[PDB]
Design a protein around this nucleic acid. Structure first.
Ligand SMILES: [Mg+2]
Ligand SMILES: [Mg+2]
Ligand SMILES: [Mg+2]
Ligand SMILES: [Mg+2]
Ligand SMILES: [Mg+2]
Ligand SMILES: [Mg+2]
Ligand SMILES: [Mg+2]
Ligand SMILES: [Mg+2]
Ligand SMILES: [Mg+2]
Ligand SMILES: [Mg+2]
Ligand SMILES: [Mg+2]
Ligand SMILES: [Mg+2]
Lengths: 48, 109
RNA sequence: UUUGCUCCACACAAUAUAGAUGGAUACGAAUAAGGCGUCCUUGUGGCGUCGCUGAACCAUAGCAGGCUAGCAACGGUGCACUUGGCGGAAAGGCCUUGGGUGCUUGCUGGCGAAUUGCAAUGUCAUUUUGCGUGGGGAUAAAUCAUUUGUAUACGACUUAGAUGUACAACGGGGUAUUGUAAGCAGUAGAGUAGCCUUGGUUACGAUCUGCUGAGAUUAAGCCUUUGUUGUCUGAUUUGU
RNA sequence: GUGAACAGCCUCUAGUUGAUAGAAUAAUGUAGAUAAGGGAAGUCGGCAAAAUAGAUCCGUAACUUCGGGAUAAGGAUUGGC
């Protein structure tokens, strides 16, 4: 916890997330979910 | 443990040679195969078939295959001194592709 | 652990001593103010008293302190026990209870001491350690080697490893990169060269199209794993 | 073989595989490279490096001792079938 009571309007701001990235960090991740990846790519030869 | 046994393995020479100097890749492959046989058979005395050395050097000093299929036979040796009475002998298997193959016991040779 | 380790008591050995030789004997505050005693109307009160240094107080007599007999009084003091409490600033001490036991120089006696030769510290303290005799108690780790890469020049650091939600090597899946593999096929192909049933057929042909966002690679410091195979007691050292 | 070429690069015959090695992959080096946007602001100074580069076609100024300057400058094209 912080050692003082910060009131600077950068603290005290109520943040509401609108979106959280979950694309792969192992590359230039293009899809948020495997479902979105399947929907974009259509049927591949292996499966899907 | 202290017996004679032959098994076929696939070694990932790709990941073992990642970043290795080009002039040292094939010698490093020889040493990595010796380390592999020592890890799997517990023998310090690893002997590489000249056919296996040919397979390693097949595409030059830098062109080592990503995966090599090896037949490793832990056999007992008895000679002048004890000196690790078990030794492993490593030969190539000469399969079409060294991909999608699991460690198997040979049970015949 | 070639009978180890530790704690208590005892004996014997060493080992030294920044230096015992009756007692480090506890308010706090002020100082142009206080301490103590006492009293009341409890205060920044009244009264008395003291200091002018600890030159005090306590202790202090006994073969380095022996052995005995009494008197007086239920005191003092050592000791091992024992009761309860308080003390964390470095407490490790302070207080307290009961019984036992020793001494008592509070007082009065009896015996002893010599020759250390006229002095010679004339040895009486406490500091560690070791060994032996009894008794009580406990029954691990660390390092090397292997391994990890959150680390790293080497040391060092961070991890894992004796039968498992274990670890490893492969394999599978996910993720990612590239950009559509080999092979086969085509009434694709600019055209070209032959043949004859002259609308087809054979040959060459960069390339194009389909199977084919395919194939390849993917931890080496990616993620995951109901699969396969295997591994799991080597070395050195550490004791109050 | 490529290519204008005894260039560079690869190969045949012949020869050699000899330079102390092994393990790691810190700093700083030596040698080789790349770099967003800017583009010499760096520096005594563009030092170093980069850019250009072959061939074919087009086009080529001042000046000139008329011989040059000249590959001036400046452009376009290049594979395979
Ligand atoms: Mg990333
Ligand atoms: Mg590298
Ligand atoms: Mg020519
Ligand atoms: Mg730049
Ligand atoms: Mg740029
Ligand atoms: Mg510019
Ligand atoms: Mg300047
Ligand atoms: Mg300047
Ligand atoms: Mg200047
Ligand atoms: Mg220059
Ligand atoms: Mg020009
Ligand atoms: Mg000029």
């Amino acid at each position: 916890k912080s050692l003082y009571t910060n009131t600077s309007r950068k603290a005290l701001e109520e943040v509401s997330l609108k979106w959280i990235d979950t694309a792969s960090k192992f590359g230039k991740g293009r899809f948020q979910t495997p479902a979105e990846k399947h929907a974009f790519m259509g049927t591949l030869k292996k499966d899907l | 443990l202290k017996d004679v046994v032959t098994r076929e393995y696939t070694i990932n020479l790709h990941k073992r040679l990642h970043g290795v100097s080009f002039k040292k890749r094939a010698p490093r492959a020889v040493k990595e195969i010796k380390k592999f046989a020592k890890l799997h058979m517990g023998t310090d005395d690893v002997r590489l078939a000249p056919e296996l050395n040919q397979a390693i050097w097949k595409r030059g000093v830098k062109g080592v295959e990503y995966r090599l299929r090896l037949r490793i036979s832990r056999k007992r040796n008895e000679e002048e001194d004890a000196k690790n009475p078990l030794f492993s002998y490593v030969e190539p298997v000469l399969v079409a592709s060294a991909k999608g193959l699991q460690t198997v016991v040979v049970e015949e040779d």
